[PDB]
C-alpha cells in the first residue's frame, strides 16, 4: 500500500491537535479558528452522504480520539464560543468511535449540553449528524431519564425539543422512509406517554403537506395492532384526528374508530357517533358511512342520528333502523337471483349418482342450505310436513324452522308463511314456527312483534319444551339492538327458577347476543341463578353449557378484564365448577395479542395427565387456545397449528384425541389445502380404538368451512366408504351436513367474521354457542338441532360493488385482483400481482380479492372499504 | 471391514444365513479390457513404417504436441486441434499409423464400429451414442478411432447413396459434442476413409476438421523399404537383389 502524499488533512490538522495542548493558553484565537476551519472542511466533504471515511473524523482515530475525548473536560478554560466548537467536534466522532453499546456513553459530547443551534447544521445528513444523536439519546439516556423524571435539566428539557426537531426534520427533506423511522422514535420514547409524541407529530403532519397525510395514517393504523392497553388507548385516541382534523375526508375516521370502541372505552364510541351525527356533511358521505353502521360493524346507531333537522339530512337514520335489512334482502334477491340464482338448485341431494328419521331430519337442513338467498318455498317442503307425523318430533320442529331458514331475511310476508303451517297445536310445531319467524326477521330490528306475538307465545309456557323454542328466535331477531327492555323481559325467563332449565339456557344465550357490555345486574342475576341451581346438583353439562356461556356472553367484548376478575372472585369455587374461568376470560379477549397471557393461562395445568379432576378446565383451556384468531395478523396461525399438532395430536387420550380438531374450525373458515389435508389425515382414518364419534366430529369440523371448492368431491368418495363403516345413524347425518353446509348455494359463505377491512366481528358471538354446541356425544336430538341450524345468520351474501344511488343508475365498472398485502412501497403502493382479471359485472368479488376502478371513477364516495361504495361520478380526468 | 474400502462395483463374499459381508474378492475385469480383447486391434510401433516420414511429422504436430506441451500452444494464443482425417487407397497404413501413434504417446486406444456383441459393455440400452464418453473420460488421455467401411470405401454408393448409418453421422455427433460443451480435455477423434470427394457437405466446413493427410500409393523406394521391413521374419539367403523384385511390382499397394 501507500501512505501520505495525497493525505493533506492527516499531516497539518493532525499535528494541530497535538500542539493544541500548548495552544490552550495565550492562543484564544487559534483554538476557535482551527476548529472553524476543520468544521468548514468537514462540512464541505460531508455535503454528500457518500464518503463515510472523512479525512478528519475517520483518520483521527489513530491518536486524535483521545484528544477529542480530552477536549472539554481536560481544558478548564472553555469559553462560550469554544465550548460550541468542542461539543460539535466531539459529537460527530464519538457516536461511531465506541463499540455497539454506545447508547449509554453519548453524554460526554452531545447529551451534556446543546451547542448553539446544531439542528441548523444537521440538515445535511439523514441519520448521521443529529438523527443518530437523538436516537441514541432516546434509546438509553432518555429512556432511563424520561421513564418517570421527564422534567429534568438540559439533558431532558432541551432533549425533548431536539427530539421533536429531529422528528420534524426526518419528514422535512423528502418525507422518505426517514419519516417512517420518525414514528418509531416517537413510539420508543415515552411509549406509555405516547400522547405527547403524537401531539408533537400532529402539528407537523397537519402543516407538512396535503399528500403526506394518507401514508402516515395508513402506517399508524398498520402499527396500531400491537401495543399495551394504555398504549393502545393512546394510539386509538391519537389517530382519530388524523383523518378528521388534519384530513378532510371525514369518512375513514368514523369507520376506523371501531377499534377505539371496545378497546379504549364505550364513551369514545358514543362521542364518535355523536360527532358523526353532528357532522352531517350533507347526506352522501354520512349515509354511506351509516349504511354499514347498523349490523356490519356495530349497532345502536339509529338513535343518535335524530337531530332537529330530520328532513333530508337527519332522517336517513330511519333508513338505517329498518330499511337497511329490507334493502339488503331486496339486493340479494334482485341482483343475484336475476343473474345466476335458480329457483331451486337441489343439486346436493342428486350427488348420489356415481332409511330412518335421521335422513329425514338431514333433508330439512339440506333443503335450507340449498334454499338460501331469499329462497322462499310455497309447500315445496311437503316431505318435512309428511315426516312430522311419523317420528322425530324435535326433527319435525327443525324441519318446520327450515321453512323460515329458506326464506332468510324476510319481514314482509314471512310471518304469514310461518303461520300457514304454525296452526298445529303441538308442543314442537309452535316452537318451530317461532324459530322460523325469528330467523326470517333476522337483522330487521323492527317493532313487528316485540311484545305482541312473541309475548303471545311466551305467555302460554305451561307446557313442554315449546317454552324454550320461543326465545331463541325472539333473541335472534333482537340481537342487533341493545335495548334494556328486551333484556329485562328475557331476564325473568332465566330467573323463573322453574323446571325449564332449557328456557333459562336459551334466555342466557339470547341475551348474550343482545347486550354484552354494561348493566352488570344481568350478569349478577345469571351468576346467582347458576349458584342457586348448579350448587345442589351433579347432573349433565346443561348448566355448564348455559352458566359459563351466559356469564361469558353477558360480559363479552371488554378488554379491561376487570369485570372478569370480579366475576371470578365472586364465583370462587372448585376448578370443575369453575369452567367459566377460561370462558369468561376469553369472552373478554375477543381480539388482541395474548400469547404470553395464553401461556400463563395454560400454565395452571399444561398436561397434568388429565386425571378426571379438572376436565371442564381442560376443555376450557383447549377452547381458549382456539382463540386469538380474530385478528391474528397471519402470524400466530403457524405457531398455533404447530402447538396443536405437538401437544394435542402428539399426546392425548380423551382431551387430545377428541377435541384436537375442534379448534380447526375456529382457526379459519375459508378453506386451505394445508388444514384440509391435516384434518383429513386424522379424520379419514378409522382409528376405532379411539372415540369414533369424536372422529366424526373432527370430520364435521374439517368440512366446517363454507365456500366449497371442486375438491369436495373427494369427501364424496369417503361417502362410499361410509356405506359399511361409519354407521349411518352415527356418521351419515354428520357427513351429509358437513358436505351440504359448505356448498349451500354460491354466496353467503362469510363465516370468518371479518367486516370491511379488519373488523373483529360480533358474528363470532353467534358462532360462539355453535363452537360450544358440538362438544359431547348423542349428536343433536333436542337441543343441538335447535341451535346448530340457526347459530349464525348474519352473513353478507355476495355483492361488493354497486352504485346504491338515488336512481341506482351505475351498475359496474371495475377490475378485480388479489387483496392488498403491502406495508411499505412507493407513492402508488402496489396492491397485489393478480391483475390478470377484469370484469364488468357486480357479482361475486371473491373472498381474498379487491376490485379497483378506472375511467376516472376512483370511487369518490368511500374509496376505503364498505363493499357498498357509492362511487360518485367524477370527470376531472380527460 | 471398513466402508471406505468398499468401493462401488467390487466383488465381495456374503455369508449364508445372514448375508453379512465377509471378505473382498480380488477384482473383476473392466469392460474396456473385454471390448478391446474382442476387437483385437493388431498394435504396432514406429519401427514398422515404410516411406511415411512426412505423414509421421504431420500427425505428430497435431496429436502428440497438445498433450505434453499445452503451454507451447498457449503462447501463440490459438485453439488446440481436436480432429484429424486420413484418406488414401485401401491397405496403405492408416490404421497402423494411428495405432503406433497411440501406443508411443501412452494413450488409451478405443475404436467403435457400431456392432452389437460389445453393446453389453457400453450400456444396457444405449439409445444414444455419446454414452461412450462416460467410459472414455475416466481414461482421460484417450483416442477414438473409426474407420469407414467398404460400403463407401469399395462399394461407394448403393444406387442413390443417401446417408451412411455408420461412421459419418457418429462423427458428426462426436464433433458436435466436444466443440465447447465438453469439459474434459485430452480427448481426440481420428477419421479414416478414401476418396474424400464423397464426404457430405456438413463435414467439409472449414471449422470442423483441423487437418487432412494424404496416403499416396508407394513408389519404388517405399516398396523397397516395405520389402526390406517384411523380409526379416524368414530364413533368407545371402544375396537376393531386392531392387529387381521391387521394380517388378507396378506399385499396387503395401
Amino acid at each position: 500500500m501507500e501512505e501520505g502524499g495525497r493525505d493533506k488533512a492527516p499531516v497539518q490538522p493532525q499535528q494541530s491537535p497535538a500542539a493544541a495542548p500548548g495552544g490552550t493558553d495565550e492562543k484564544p484565537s487559534g483554538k476557535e479558528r482551527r476548529d472553524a476551519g476543520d468544521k468548514d472542511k468537514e462540512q464541505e466533504l460531508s455535503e454528500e452522504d457518500k464518503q463515510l471515511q472523512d479525512e478528519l473524523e475517520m483518520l483521527v482515530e489513530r491518536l486524535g480520539e483521545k484528544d477529542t475525548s480530552l477536549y472539554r473536560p481536560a481544558l478548564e478554560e472553555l469559553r462560550r464560543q469554544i465550548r460550541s466548537s468542542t461539543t460539535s467536534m466531539t459529537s460527530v466522532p464519538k457516536p461511531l468511535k465506541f463499540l455497539r453499546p454506545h447508547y449509554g456513553k453519548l453524554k460526554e459530547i452531545y447529551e451534556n449540553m446543546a451547542p448553539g443551534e446544531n439542528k441548523r447544521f444537521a440538515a445535511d445528513i439523514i441519520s448521521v449528524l443529529a438523527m443518530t444523536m437523538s436516537g441514541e439519546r432516546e434509546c438509553l439516556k432518555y429512556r432511563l431519564v424520561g421513564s418517570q423524571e421527564e422534567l429534568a435539566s438540559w439533558g431532558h428539557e432541551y432533549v425533548r425539543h431536539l427530539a421533536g426537531e429531529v422528528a420534524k426534520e426526518w419528514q422535512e427533506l423528502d418525507d422518505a422512509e426517514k419519516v417512517q423511522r420518525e414514528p418509531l422514535l416517537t413510539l420508543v420514547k415515552e411509549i406509555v406517554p405516547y400522547n405527547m409524541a403524537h401531539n408533537a407529530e400532529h402539528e407537523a403532519c397537519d402543516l407538512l403537506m396535503e399528500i403526506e397525510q394518507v401514508d402516515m395514517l395508513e402506517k399508524d393504523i398498520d402499527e396500531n395492532a400491537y401495543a399495551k392497553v394504555c398504549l393502545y388507548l393512546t394510539s386509538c385516541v391519537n389517530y382519530v384526528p388524523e383523518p378528521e382534523n388534519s384530513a378532510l375526508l371525514r369518512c375513514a375516521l368514523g369507520v376506523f374508530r371501531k377499534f377505539s370502541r371496545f378497546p379504549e372505552a364505550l364513551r369514545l364510541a358514543l362521542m364518535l357517533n355523536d360527532m358523526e351525527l353532528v357532522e352531517d356533511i350533507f347526506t352522501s358521505c354520512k349515509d354511506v358511512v351509516v349504511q354499514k353502521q347498523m349490523a356490519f360493524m356495530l349497532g345502536r346507531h339509529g338513535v343518535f342520528l335524530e337531530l332537529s333537522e330530520d328532513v333530508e339530512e337527519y332522517e336517513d337514520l330511519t333508513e338505517i333502523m329498518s330499511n337497511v335489512q329490507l334493502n339488503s334482502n331486496f339486493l340479494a334477491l334482485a341482483r343475484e337471483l336475476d343473474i345466476m340464482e335458480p329457483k331451486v338448485p337441489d343439486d346436493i341431494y342428486k350427488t348420489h349418482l356415481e332409511d330412518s328419521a335421521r335422513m329425514n331430519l338431514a333433508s330439512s337442513f339440506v333443503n335450507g342450505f340449498v334454499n338460501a338467498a331469499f329462497g322462499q318455498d310455497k309447500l315445496l317442503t311437503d316431505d318435512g310436513n309428511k315426516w312430522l307425523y311419523k317420528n322425530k318430533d324435535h326433527g319435525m320442529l327443525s324441519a318446520a324452522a327450515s321453512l323460515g331458514m329458506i326464506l332468510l331475511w324476510d319481514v314482509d310476508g314471512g310471518l304469514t308463511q310461518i303461520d300457514k303451517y304454525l296452526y298445529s297445536s303441538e308442543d314442537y310445531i309452535k316452537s318451530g314456527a317461532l324459530l322460523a319467524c325469528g330467523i326470517v326477521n333476522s337483522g330487521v330490528r323492527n317493532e313487528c312483534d316485540p311484545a305482541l306475538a312473541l309475548l303471545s307465545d311466551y305467555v302460554l309456557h305451561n307446557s313442554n319444551t315449546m317454552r324454550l323454542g320461543s326465545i331463541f328466535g325472539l333473541g335472534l331477531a333482537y340481537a342487533g339492538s341493545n335495548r334494556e327492555d328486551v333484556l329485562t323481559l328475557l331476564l325473568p325467563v332465566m330467573g323463573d327458577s322453574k323446571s325449564s332449565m332449557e328456557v333459562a339456557g336459551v334466555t342466557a344465550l339470547a341475551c348474550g347476543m343482545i347486550a354484552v357490555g354494561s348493566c352488570n345486574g344481568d350478569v349478577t342475576s345469571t351468576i346467582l341463578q347458576t349458584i342457586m341451581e348448579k350448587s345442589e346438583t351433579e347432573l349433565k353439562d346443561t348448566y355448564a353449557r348455559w352458566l359459563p356461556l351466559g356469564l361469558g356472553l353477558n360480559h363479552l367484548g371488554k378488554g379491561e378484564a376487570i369485570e372478569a376478575i370480579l366475576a371470578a372472585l365472586e364465583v370462587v369455587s372448585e376448578p370443575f365448577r369453575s369452567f367459566a374461568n377460561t370462558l369468561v376470560d376469553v369472552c373478554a379477549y375477543a381480539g388482541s395479542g395474548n400469547v404470553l397471557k395464553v401461556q400463563q393461562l395454560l400454565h395452571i395445568c399444561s398436561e397434568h395427565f388429565d386425571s378426571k379432576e379438572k376436565e371442564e378446565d381442560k376443555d376450557k383451556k383447549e377452547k381458549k387456545d382456539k382463540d386469538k384468531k380474530e385478528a391474528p395478523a397471519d402470524m400466530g396461525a403457524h405457531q398455533g397449528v404447530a402447538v396443536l399438532g405437538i401437544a394435542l395430536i402428539a399426546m392425548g387420550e380423551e382431551i387430545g384425541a377428541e377435541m384436537a380438531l375442534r379448534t380447526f374450525g375456529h382457526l379459519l373458515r375459508y378453506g386451505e389445502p394445508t388444514l384440509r389435508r391435516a384434518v383429513p389425515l386424522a379424520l379419514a382414518l378409522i382409528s376405532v380404538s379411539n372415540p369414533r364419534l369424536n372422529i366424526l366430529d373432527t370430520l364435521s369440523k374439517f368440512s366446517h368451512d363454507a365456500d366449497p371448492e371442486v375438491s369436495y368431491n373427494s369427501i364424496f368418495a369417503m361417502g362410499m366408504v361410509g356405506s359399511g363403516t361409519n354407521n349411518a345413524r352415527l356418521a351419515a347425518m354428520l357427513r351429509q351436513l358437513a358436505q351440504y353446509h359448505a356448498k349451500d348455494p354460491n354466496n353467503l359463505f362469510m363465516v370468518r367474521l371479518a367486516q370491511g377491512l379488519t373488523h373483529l366481528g360480533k358474528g363470532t358471538l353467534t358462532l360462539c354457542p355453535y363452537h360450544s354446541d358440538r362438544q359431547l356425544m348423542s349428536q343433536v336430538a333436542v337441543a343441538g338441532l335447535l341451535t346448530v341450524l340457526v347459530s349464525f345468520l348474519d352473513v353478507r351474501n355476495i355483492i361488493l360493488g354497486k352504485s346504491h344511488y338515488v336512481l341506482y343508475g351505475l351498475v359496474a365498472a371495475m377490475q378485480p385482483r388479489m387483496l392488498v398485502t403491502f406495508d411499505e412501497e412507493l407513492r402508488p403502493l402496489p396492491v397485489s400481482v393478480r391483475v390478470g382479471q377484469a370484469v364488468d359485472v357486480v357479482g361475486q368479488a371473491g373472498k381474498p380479492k379487491t376490485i379497483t376502478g378506472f375511467q376516472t371513477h376512483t370511487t369518490p364516495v368511500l374509496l376505503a372499504h364498505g363493499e357498498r361504495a357509492e362511487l360518485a361520478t367524477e370527470e376531472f380526468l380527460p | 471391514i471398513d466402508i471406505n474400502d468398499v468401493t462401488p462395483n467390487c466383488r465381495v463374499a456374503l455369508r449364508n444365513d445372514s448375508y453379512t459381508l465377509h471378505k473382498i474378492l480380488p477384482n473383476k475385469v473392466d469392460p474396456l479390457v473385454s471390448l478391446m480383447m474382442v476387437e483385437k486391434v493388431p498394435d504396432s510401433t514406429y519401427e514398422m513404417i515404410g516411406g511415411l516420414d512426412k505423414q509421421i511429422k504431420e500427425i505428430k504436430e497435431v496429436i502428440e504436441l497438445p498433450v505434453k506441451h499445452p503451454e507451447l500452444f498457449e503462447a501463440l494464443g490459438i485453439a488446440q486441434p481436436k480432429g484429424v482425417l486420413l484418406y488414401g487407397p485401401p491397405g496403405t497404413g492408416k490404421t497402423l499409423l494411428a495405432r503406433a501413434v497411440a501406443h508411443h504417446t501412452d494413450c488409451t486406444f478405443i475404436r467403435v464400429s457400431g456392432s452389437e456383441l460389445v453393446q453389453k459393455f457400453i450400456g444396457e440400452g444405449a439409445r444414444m451414442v455419446r454414452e461412450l464418453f462416460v467410459m472414455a473420460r475416466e481414461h482421460a488421455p484417450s483416442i477414438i478411432f473409426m474407420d469407414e467401411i467398404d460400403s463407401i470405401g469399395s462399394s461407394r454408393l448403393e444406387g442413390g447413396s443417401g446417408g451412411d448409418s455408420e461412421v459419418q453421422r457418429t462423427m458428426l455427433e462426436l464433433l458436435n459434442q466436444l466443440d465447447g460443451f465438453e469439459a474434459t480435455k485430452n480427448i481426440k477423434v481420428i477419421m479414416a476413409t478414401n476418396r474424400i470427394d464423397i464426404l457430405d457437405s456438413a463435414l467439409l466446413r472449414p471449422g470442423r476438421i483441423d487437418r487432412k493427410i494424404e496416403f499416396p500409393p508407394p513408389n519404388e523406394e517405399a516398396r523397397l523399404d516395405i520389402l526390406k521391413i517384411h523380409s526379416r521374419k524368414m530364413n533368407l539367403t545371402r544375396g537376393i537383389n531386392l531392387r529387381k523384385i521391387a521394380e517388378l511390382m507396378p506399385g499396387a499397394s503395401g
Binding site: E138, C139, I646, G836, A838 | -
Partner: protein, 394 residues
C-alpha cells in the same frame, strides 16, 4: 437503533428453533422411515396383530372347476398347477373361473378374489386432474360449441327426457380443420366441464415394437373403460393410427392396420361397448379409412373453419381484456386487417404489441403498437403461414 441486537436475537431464535426440531428427533428417512410423530401409536400393536396373524397369501389363477365338489384347478406362473378347495369363510358363489385368487403357502386354499391385470402403461392414461379453461374463452364458434355439447354432456346430465321420448343419442364425433383453429382447446374445455372419467390417448402412443401389442392395448383400454359406470375416451391425432388399406407389393404398414381393425371392431358387433362416448380430432381428415367414418362410430362431423369477421373481433376482445391500454382503440379496424388468420396469430399479435410497449419504457400500449405488431406478425411472417396448403387438407 438496536438493529444489531434485534438481528442477533432473531438469529438466536431461529437457531434455537432448528436445534429444538433436531431435538424432537424427526430424522433419518434414508430407508423410508415415517416421522416418529406419525407411527408413534403404531409401534407394538401391529407386531402381534399384523406379523403372525397375517400370511403371505400368494396369488394364483383358477382355470376351471367341476360339479358336486369344488376340486378347483389352480395354475401359477412359475410353480406347478394343483387341485384345491376353498376355505371355511368363503362362499362358492363368487368363485367364477378365470380370475385371480389368493392361495396359502402350505395347503393351497383359496381365500379372497382379486381384480384383474391392468398394464400400468394403460393405467397412466387416466387424467385424474382438470385443466383450467372454460367455455367463456372459446369465442367465435358458438354453433360448434352448441352442437358438441348437445351430444357430449346433455345425455349424461339429464338422462330422463331422452328415455321418456324413446330416443337413443349419438355416440361419436370428429373435429377437423386447419391447424390452430381450436380443436384441442375445445377438448380441454370439455374435459374441464365434465364430471365422469376422461381417458386421454394419443395415436403415437399405440405404435409398439413387438407384433400384436396395439390390439392388446386397445382391448385393455376398453375393458378398463367398461369396468366403471360411464365415461369418456379422447383420441388425439387419429391420422397416425390408420389411413387406409393399400397392401401392394411387399407388405408394408399393416400391423398398424391390425391395430386400426381392432379399434374398429371394439365399436360395433356383438354387444357394442354401450355406455362409452369417444371423440376424435385431426387436421387432415382426407386420409382416413372409409370403414371408420360411417355412422355408428363417427355419427357427428363438427367442422372448425377460419373465423369470418366477428369471430376475429371476439378473439381480440377475449385475448386482450387483461391488458393496459387507453380508451380509444378500435378493434374493428384490426379485425379488418387480417382477412384470413387464426386465433393463434391474433394472440401472437396481442403479445407482440405488449412486447413492443415493454420495449423502450412505456406502460400503456398505444394504437401504433398494435398496427406495427400486425404489420410485423401477419404481413412479414406470411412466408411460412402454414395455412394455404392445409385449406385443401393436403
Amino acid at each position: 437503533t438496536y438493529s444489531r441486537q434485534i438481528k442477533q436475537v432473531e438469529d438466536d431464535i431461529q437457531q434455537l428453533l432448528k436445534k429444538i426440531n433436531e431435538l424432537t428427533g424427526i430424522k433419518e428417512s434414508d430407508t423410508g422411515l415415517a416421522p416418529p410423530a406419525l407411527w408413534d401409536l403404531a409401534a407394538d400393536k401391529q407386531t402381534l396383530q399384523s406379523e403372525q396373524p397375517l400370511q403371505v397369501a400368494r396369488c394364483t389363477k383358477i382355470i376351471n372347476a367341476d360339479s358336486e365338489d369344488p376340486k378347483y384347478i389352480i395354475n401359477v406362473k412359475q410353480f406347478a398347477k394343483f387341485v384345491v378347495d376353498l376355505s371355511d369363510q368363503v362362499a362358492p358363489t363368487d368363485i367364477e373361473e378365470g380370475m385371480r385368487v389368493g392361495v396359502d403357502r402350505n395347503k393351497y386354499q383359496i381365500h379372497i378374489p382379486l381384480p384383474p391385470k391392468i398394464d400400468p402403461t394403460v393405467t397412466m392414461m387416466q387424467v385424474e386432474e382438470k385443466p383450467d379453461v372454460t367455455y367463456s374463452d372459446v369465442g367465435g364458434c358458438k354453433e360448434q360449441i352448441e352442437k358438441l355439447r348437445e351430444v357430449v354432456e346433455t345425455p349424461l346430465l339429464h338422462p330422463e327426457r331422452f328415455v321418456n321420448l324413446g330416443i337413443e343419442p349419438p355416440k361419436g364425433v370428429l373435429l377437423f380443420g386447419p391447424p390452430g383453429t381450436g380443436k384441442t382447446l375445445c377438448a380441454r374445455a370439455v374435459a374441464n366441464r365434465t364430471d365422469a372419467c376422461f381417458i386421454r390417448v394419443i395415436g403415437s402412443e399405440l405404435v409398439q415394437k413387438y407384433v400384436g401389442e396395439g390390439a392388446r392395448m386397445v382391448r385393455e383400454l376398453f375393458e378398463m373403460a367398461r369396468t366403471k359406470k360411464a365415461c369418456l375416451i379422447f383420441f388425439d391425432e387419429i391420422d397416425a393410427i390408420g389411413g387406409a388399406r393399400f397392401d401392394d407389393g411387399a407388405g408394408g404398414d399393416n400391423e398398424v392396420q391390425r391395430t386400426m381393425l381392432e379399434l374398429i371392431n371394439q365399436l360395433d358387433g356383438f354387444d357394442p361397448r354401450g355406455n362409452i362416448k369417444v371423440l376424435m380430432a385431426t387436421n387432415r381428415p382426407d386420409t382416413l379409412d372409409p370403414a371408420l367414418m360411417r355412422p355408428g362410430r363417427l355419427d357427428r362431423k363438427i367442422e372448425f373453419s377460419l373465423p369470418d369477421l366477428e369471430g376475429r373481433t371476439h378473439i381480440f376482445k377475449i385475448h386482450a381484456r387483461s391488458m393496459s391500454v387507453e380508451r380509444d382503440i378500435r378493434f374493428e379496424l384490426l379485425a379488418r386487417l387480417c382477412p384470413n388468420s387464426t386465433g393463434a396469430e391474433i394472440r401472437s399479435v396481442c403479445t407482440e404489441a405488449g412486447m413492443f410497449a415493454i420495449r423502450a419504457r412505456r406502460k400503456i400500449a398505444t394504437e401504433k403498437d398494435f398496427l406495427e405488431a400486425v404489420n410485423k406478425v401477419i404481413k412479414s411472417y406470411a412466408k411460412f403461414s402454414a395455412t394455404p396448403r392445409y385449406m385443401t387438407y393436403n
